Design a protein around this ligand. Structure first.
Ligand SMILES: CCCCCCCCCCCCCCCCCC(=O)OC[C@H](COP(=O)([O-])OCC(O)COP(=O)([O-])OC[C@@H](COC(=O)CCCCCCCCCCCCCCCCC)OC(=O)CCCCCCCCCCCCCCCCC)OC(=O)CCCCCCCCCCCCCCCCC
Ligand SMILES: CCCCCCCC/C=C\CCCCCCCC(=O)OC[C@H](COP(=O)(O)OCCN)OC(=O)CCCCCCC/C=C\CCCCCCCC
Ligand SMILES: [Ca+2]
Ligand SMILES: [Ca+2]
Ligand SMILES: [Ca+2]
Ligand SMILES: [Ca+2]
Ligand SMILES: [Ca+2]
Lengths: 280, 246, 280, 280, 280, 280, 246
């Protein structure tokens, strides 16, 4: 086929040195993109998590309203602003009637802080981990492509057809193989370096996000629904008891009023008898 | 029913890549390249040894042919009766080498040609081709298949001895012409061989003849002092053993 | 048997060029299928999610009903129509008696919006990610099969029966290896490209789906069950004192009523005595 | 060692053509086992899911009891029967007095349908995906094993004693390498074919299971517990108001009856006065 | 370095046949460890799960107290004792006062049994599936080490100084390659066999664990909290209606008794009038 | 490019022995880091978990207050301190009235202890398993880079000019690759050892964490919310019945009191009649 | 507050090995095997002529060794005096072959050993190995470099002529134990003549010896038929011409 032979002469026409150069340049571009979009971003995320954890620890012993205002003013970055809004929705404010007004006496947790400051939303999506965990494989595959294409160039040049020029063919083959393996080794080195950096960064991000959510979880106490159920059960029992005592007390008061009415009737009857005796 | 719908999710640690088939593939990539390189290098090397041996043998043959050609040209220039055959590395005598019954000495032309060919052989061995390839020269005797076998053998061997004497007899012109170094070199080169009975065409004139052939080092042959027997310098003249009344 | 030799004669009879062409054609067809069924679909999904987020970020200040019909009319997809219906079932509408009728005053979220507009229902199943995440392996396998078949062709051609035929045979076999490696190299390049695009599409889709569900989550507030339990506990606590006060007030009213009855009886029987004495 | 040489002679003693035949037959047997135990079962599962979805969509506009009976009769496979029993007992049936017996007026969903008709329960375990996702690697490994074994046979039987013995041994080596290439090509082809069929089947199974569980999820509404709590809160408030109103009505009507009693006593005492006057 | 040179010269002087023997011994030891620690344990786990499932299916139609005693006896002399204890804690026993004694009439499930009889604590931890999914790779690594080392030894020994030495060099090289291939074939065969065996056994383990936890779930029904909430709602409505009717009935009774008292008073006053007439 | 040739001659000018020593030193330093930060850390974690489990099993029969105080004093490591604090927030203390006081009679569990003493918190974050599970791949990559570097050194120095040069170059290339493979085989052996140690350590950490949480779960009984709902339902039914009973009892008492009043007023009417007769 | 406790989560489903890596390992192994076997075939093809020549050389060596071992076994069985050097194809009569100064005869043992070994060597040459690889036998002569050269040459030549006489002289004990065909075979397989100089031995008495040194065809010679000549039947008995009484 003319098409396939033209394709081969086009591919093999490139100078062999451009193959390791292309692999190294593109793999270095991938490494630079990894540094900019994953590594520095994760460093910023870790520093922000540490600073937020420090801020939360400073309001451990403050009033619940003051704590709430400080946390609302603290969280302003978009994803943590949304996470804080949802978390504050999860928090349950217990009100008591004090000095004629309803005041928040205690804020109760209903869900863990990690349910809204999740690893996904705060780490995995901003860092694009769904893509970057596959970058080392892409780099290794790029090295493999360089390896095939370099050995293709080397096998293409190997066609001596004469004992005198066998040495030149062997030299060219060794040079092309050397280029291919330089590219492959650089790609593998970059892939393992990226693996090191990304896994270390993701581990540190998860560790400090755990510290941040633990700091948030220590502000508010959970288990309020069970306390409400216990209050309801106790209320029902004391309600039956109070009902029976109110019935008995009503009966007693009714008896007292009826004996008082009988005494008043007796007084009226004796006064009537006295009046009749006076008249008679 | 008492749980919370806003619970933690994504509790899924990513599985690590299995690294050992990757190692297998990359180490076989390296091994495949190693085997390709050893293939081409070994093929090139073996072919180079084969062609080197072939061209070395051809160069040795060419040097032998050049030595024979120049020796034959010198023989023609000196005197014309010499017959040199490069195809079998043999110098023969056309007619002067004949012999009659109960005869053990060449004619005057035969003795003259025998004396003339010696310096040519010395020059041939002196040259670079001689140093590179030239072995000692043996002398072969030829006689008809008829008559007494022992008579023919003794006669031919006497012819060979007389030739050797004429080479090294003091009364011979060679001794008074050559020097001590040339005499020692002749002692190293000229040797006496056996007796052959190649009788053909029923021609007794050409059957009873003596000719000298030169041998050559092989390509694998080694030059060493053990084979290089050094004769002591001549301290006394040499008189031949077969006297004229014989 | 002779069957194996017969088939090996059959397979290794094709021209060496026909194998890289077949590999390139099939790999290109699979790449085009990836671009059509996956990449364009993922792009359409991402733009749809962006458009949907804009509309939700637009009704954030509307009345809860108007928001509800706007969201109902907004979601016209089969997967998203079902997800919206289930999410609306998850929303708890609060009614208060206004103008003599029950009107929605507030809509509360009982589950996160991602429980219905999830990644599997909106991205993984539409994109067939259970299949397309394994496509690069398929492409590389096709390339490896092509390389193997080309190697069989080349090895069948190799037969140096003469010392002078060795160089030609070796060169021809290296050329056949070149063809097979061309097939493999193209397949692996395409697989790496597919992996890059597919992972990037997943990352973008997940990020934009998170933005969409965050927009939906912001419209409604949670914690309605804890509020209901707190209201129930408060009602029981107030009802105990209500029963006690109602009983006390009833007893006091009975006391006043019986005192008035006694006074009326006194007045009436005094009038009776006066009338009887006068008539006597 | 003698042991190693005995092992080599025992293993190599088989005919060279029996290695490609063994690889092809073993890979074909694994492919047939895959077709019988995975592909046909997956096709049956997908067809059943589509039929069940059609049946569920047909029963949308029926009474709750009829829907329950139809769905109970529908699911007869053991995994489907267990899943339906769990889902049905997760469903909440609301009873209302209409008009002398308990009648089901509505059925509510307290859990997603996918909690019981899950991918693990209905696709992953019946299809044995925990084994079959590793089959292509096994196929490729058998190809590699066949390559190594065929070359072992070729190398062990190499006879360098005599030049035509060398020629025959070299021919055997070339045939063995061709055989190894053929076996590897077949193994990798069957591996990628199994991968394609398996991943396509699993993706279609997930798609149609999602459609089926969406069909079940459309039959019933969620949020019944929040509605019950809202009803309880409203009932508590209305009970407080009703208790106050009932006390007011009771005291008013008691006042009425006491006024009636006083008036009747006054009238009867007037009659007594008339009788006393008649006596005199 | 002298130490590196000594190590290299001793590693080059190793007999080629010792490398495959070491590979075979190490891979056989790994396979024996696999059989002892994974395969036999998986078989025992599967048999125990089937025995437990048969035991559970024997009390489908038994009384709830008898069922609980049977299950406690079944799991008490086992490693599943704590899992069963937690599961029974998750069970809600409904009581009814029958013949003056509180008796268990029904048992309700409040959580799935898979949450207590988990896959990790019943299958993954006992079988060390975390490690044994890596054993095929371990065997592959042993194979590649042995093969590369043997091929290096073979190439080091291969050096035809003259064309007359080509035959002997080729023969010795083929012997060394045969040894390396033996090692690799054994290692990769064991890798594939381990993969097949442990994947099949883990699939069976998951299947029978599912059958076990489904037999546990088939015993008891869920949704008791929604039933309790529905009962509370009905009771609240009925209590409002009951309060109204009790108030009305008390009013009617009070009216009737006051009418009777008025009649009695009228009769008494008529008797007084008769007595007054008699006194005259 | 001259840059590529310059870097090639720079890279390949290092002594061939410096590749294996570099690979061995780097792999050994990574192994020492693994041992110090993961293996020793996990061993300490397992020892601490066993000691904590022993401590918890010793307060099984203690009073709720005493065992609560013991557990509060037990947990002082920061991660387990926070975990215990949140778990104790999850525990629901039930109070009863003894000697006119509210004291704890029983502590109930609302969440499993694994929710707070989770695998992440206590094992994964301390051990950095998000990173250390990728270490074998890094070690393998380093070995591969070493082998490729040695091959490149051997290929750069190859001289195919003369047959003696060819033989010497082949020997040098094989020697350099043999050094590099010494390093690579060390890397693969260390990768195998790290894989085994890591998987075994993580499995045992999960096992003893499960045992620890099992010890903590056995102290407290779950299922308190369903019991509270059942108690509320029973209280509602009893309240309805008691409402009717109290209404009936109040009616009966009112009838008795009015009968007593009628008798008393009849006696007083008789006394008045007697007094009137006496006055006559 | 109203979460679903029955929500299930997928297990820890570790993914399979990526097929590309195992397929790539398969391909790399196949390529490594291809390059190995192509190297083996190419090297076995380029050197197949060299392999065949070396095999032929080894076969010639085996045949020559077998023939020499058979001949020396016959010598050991028959006569202890005959010692055969198979390393360099020499027949030695050391004790029986010593030559005193200026005499060309030998003691009784020399003749007994010679006339005993000639029929044995003839029988060996008549075998298929002999009829395939055995050329004529060369009589070895040795001379020292001291004294007059031609006297030593004449002494060696007379020794060779005496050896040939003793092989083929009338009234000899061998002639009574011979047939005409065997005599013709001796005449064809034996040539008398040859002188040499060597210093490989420590004593000058060693140079006073005679030896039989058979030589064989080369691999590419293969018994050129045209080289062979013929002799007529014996008409009269041979007579030695050396001076027996001296
Ligand atoms: C013929 C030999 C030729 C071949 C030699 C090479 C072999 C290669 C094979 C490759 C790997 C195949 C292994 C498969 C089986 C292992 C699977 C498994 O997990 O077993 C379960 C089992 C434990 O789980 P289980 O089934 O529940 O057991 C019950 C528990 O014991 C009790 O229950 P529990 O959970 O309550 O217990 C508490 C738990 C929790 O306690 C802890 O704190 C443990 C957590 C961390 C563990 C720390 C241990 C560190 C040990 C350091 C190194 C020791 C040896 C290393 C050997 C390699 C060096 C060459 O404690 C443990 O689990 C500790 C036990 C682990 C130590 C095992 C004993 C040491 C070596 C075995 C001695 C027998 C000799 C055999 C041959 C030796 C090799 C030459 O582990 C074993 O007993 C395995 C031992 C079998 C042999 C292992 C060989 C080592 C493999 C390393 C790779 C070699 C690479 C070369 C290095 C060179 C670098 C340059
Ligand atoms: C647990 C490994 C997992 C899989 C590994 C695959 C194969 C890798 C290994 C190994 C080499 C084969 C083992 C041989 C053991 C025999 C020991 C013995 O019995 O004798 C003691 C011996 C005497 O014999 P020699 O004098 O050396 O004989 C020379 C004959 N030409 O003296 C000794 O004390 C021990 C000498 C050790 C020799 C072998 C060294 C192997 C060490 C590590 C192997 C690592 C992989 C190889 C990489 C090589 C890269 C340069
Ligand atoms: Ca807390
Ligand atoms: Ca919200
Ligand atoms: Ca629904
Ligand atoms: Ca059930
Ligand atoms: Ca418990």
């Amino acid at each position: 086929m003319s098409w396939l032979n033209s394709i081969l002469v086009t591919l093999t026409s490139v100078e062999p040195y451009k193959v390791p150069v292309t692999v190294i340049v593109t793999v270095t571009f991938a490494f630079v993109c990894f540094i900019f979009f994953y590594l520095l971003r994760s460093i910023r995320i870790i520093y922000g998590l540490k600073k937020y954890t420090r801020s939360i620890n400073s309001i451990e012993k403050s009033a619940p309203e003051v704590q709430l205002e400080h946390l609302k003013s603290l969280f302003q970055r978009s994803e943590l602003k949304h996470a804080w809004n949802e978390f504050e929705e999860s928090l349950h404010s217990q009100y008591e009637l004090e000095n004629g007004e309803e005041k928040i006496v205690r804020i109760r947790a209903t869900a863990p802080s990690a349910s809204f400051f999740s690893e996904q939303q705060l780490v995995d999506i901003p860092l694009n981990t769904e893509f970057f965990k596959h970058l080392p494989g892409i780099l290794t595959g790029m090295g493999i492509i360089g390896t095939f294409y370099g050995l293709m160039i080397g096998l293409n040049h190997f066609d001596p057809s004469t004992p005198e020029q066998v040495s030149s063919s062997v030299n060219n083959l060794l040079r092309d193989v050397l280029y291919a393996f330089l590219g492959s080794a650089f790609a593998i080195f970059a892939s393992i370096l990226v693996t090191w950096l990304e896994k270390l960064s993701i581990a540190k991000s998860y560790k400090y996000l755990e510290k941040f959510t633990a700091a948030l979880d220590s502000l508010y106490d959970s288990g309020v629904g069970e306390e409400y159920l216990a209050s309801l059960v106790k209320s029902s029992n004391e309600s039956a008891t109070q009902a029976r005592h109110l019935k008995e007390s009503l009966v007693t008061d009714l008896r007292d009023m009826l004996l008082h009415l009988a005494e008043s009737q007796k007084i009226e009857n004796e006064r009537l008898a006295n009046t009749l005796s006076a008249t008679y | 029913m008492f749980g919370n719908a806003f619970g933690v999710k994504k509790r899924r640690s990513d599985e690590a890549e299995k690294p050992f088939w990757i190692s297998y593939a990359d180490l076989m990539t390296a091994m495949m390249v190693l085997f390709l390189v050893v293939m081409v290098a070994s093929l090139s090397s073996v072919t180079q040894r084969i062609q080197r041996a072939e061209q070395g043998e051809k160069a040795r043959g060419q040097d032998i042919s050049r030595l024979c050609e120049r020796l034959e040209l010198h023989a023609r220039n000196v005197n014309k009766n010499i017959v040199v055959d490069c195809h079998d590395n043999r110098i023969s005598f056309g007619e002067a080498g004949r012999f009659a019954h109960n005869q053990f000495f060449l004619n005057a032309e035969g003795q003259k040609a025998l004396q003339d060919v010696v310096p040519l052989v010395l020059e041939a061995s002196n040259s670079e081709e001689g140093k590179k390839w030239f072995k000692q020269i043996v002398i072969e005797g030829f006689t008809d298949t008829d008559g007494s076998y022992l008579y023919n053998l003794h006669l031919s061997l006497q012819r060979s001895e007389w030739v050797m004497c004429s080479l090294l007899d003091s009364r011979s012109p060679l001794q008074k012409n050559i020097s001590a170094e040339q005499q020692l070199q002749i002692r190293k080169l000229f040797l006496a061989g056996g007796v052959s009975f190649n009788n053909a065409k029923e021609s007794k004139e050409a059957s009873r003849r003596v000719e000298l052939r030169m041998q050559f080092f092989g390509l694998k042959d080694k030059r060493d002092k053990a084979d290089e027997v050094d004769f002591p310098p001549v301290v006394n003249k040499e008189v031949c053993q077969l006297v004229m009344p014989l």
